[PDB]
Amino acid sequence: TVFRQENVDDYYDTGEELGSGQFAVVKKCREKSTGLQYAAKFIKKRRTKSSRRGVSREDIEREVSILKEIQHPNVITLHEVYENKTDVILILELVAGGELFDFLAEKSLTEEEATEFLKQILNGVYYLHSLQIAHFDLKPENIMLLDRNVPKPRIKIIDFGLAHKIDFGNEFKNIFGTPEFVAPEIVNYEPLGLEADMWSIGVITYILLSGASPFLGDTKQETLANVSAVNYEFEDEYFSNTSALAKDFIRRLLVKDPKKRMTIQDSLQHPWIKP
Ligand SMILES: O=c1c(-c2ccc(O)c(O)c2)coc2cc(O)ccc12
Numbered sequence: 001t002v003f004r005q006e007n008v009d010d011y012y013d014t015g016e017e018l019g020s021g022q023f024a025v026v027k028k029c030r031e032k033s034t035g036l037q038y039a040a041k042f043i044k045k046r047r048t049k050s051s052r053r054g055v056s057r058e059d060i061e062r063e064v065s066i067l068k069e070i071q072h073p074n075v076i077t078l079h080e081v082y083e084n085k086t087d088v089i090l091i092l093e094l095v096a097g098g099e100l101f102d103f104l105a106e107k108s109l110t111e112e113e114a115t116e117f118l119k120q121i122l123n124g125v126y127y128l129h130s131l132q133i134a135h136f137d138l139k140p141e142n143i144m145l146l147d148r149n150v151p152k153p154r155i156k157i158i159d160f161g162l163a164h165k166i167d168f169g170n171e172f173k174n175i176f177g178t179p180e181f182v183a184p185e186i187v188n189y190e191p192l193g194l195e196a197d198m199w200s201i202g203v204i205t206y207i208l209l210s211g212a213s214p215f216l217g218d219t220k221q222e223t224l225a226n227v228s229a230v231n232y233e234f235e236d237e238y239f240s241n242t243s244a245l246a247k248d249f250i251r252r253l254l255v256k257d258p259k260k261r262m263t264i265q266d267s268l269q270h271p272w273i274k275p
Pocket residue numbers: 018019020021022024025026038039041076092093094095096141144158159
């Protein structure tokens with residue numbers, strides 16, 4: 001599949017940088033014809049077949065195809081795609097309230113505040129998993145607030161760079177995200193499905209409640225070893241006044257066997273979440 005090959009700057013003016021990763025940089029932008037604002041994600045293309053810098057066209061095409069399916073209040077949307085020889089440029093919905101990660105660094109949250117975010121995250125993941133879309137990169141840096149200066153911020157899930165459609169219940173590729181948030185099946189290079197996202201949600205929930213990361217080691221590999229062993233515990237110093245039901249929620253997500261792990265539907269019916 002090919003994308004619009006006109007110069008993006010003939011149609012948009014760019015502004016503040018919103019994020020910068022390994023192969024992508026995201027810039028605030030404004031469409032000339034409408035005055036409407038977006039976020040332009042510039043993704044570096046691979047320059048040769050066997051190269052290791054940049055993103056493969058197959059990977060970019062998968063990301064675009066997935067993004068095109070999405071319309072939901074808690075998930076980022078795609079407006080337009082441009083390309084040239086160097087980059088593919090995704091014109092994405094603008095979310096201007098910054099990362100949940102940076103937000104958490106200001107405020108630990110109360111259980112009510114934690115569930116305020118969690119419920120939106122769960123609604124967004126429910127949508128994705130209903131479409132057999134596994135995100136595979138759920139973490140606080142990939143949850144964006146619309147407005148961080150309101151008591152109950154609205155959020156959107158971003159970054160579909162590792163997302164996959166799971167049409168056979170499981171998938172077997174090179175997929176591997178951030179050690180603190182990856183499920184044991186990813187660590188052990190086993191077939192992956194929708195369940196891996198649910199583990200990541202357990203990790204996110206632990207962090208929201210405590211301000212600490214449950215599996216974090218001194219190095220990348222030690223974190224990975226902790227994940228595979230399910231080496232975590234609820235520190236009394238952090239959880240002494242947290243409800244046992246909140247711990248129960250996390251406990252049913254941080255489960256090594258993906259088939260024993262709570263599904264997105266289970267999590268929405270869990271007594272801690274369910275109204
Ligand atoms: O994708 C993003 C990122 C982003 C955050 C961290 C990264 O490492 C990265 O490469 C990109 C930040 O702000 C955004 C705002 C949007 O409206 C859409 C997408 C993004």
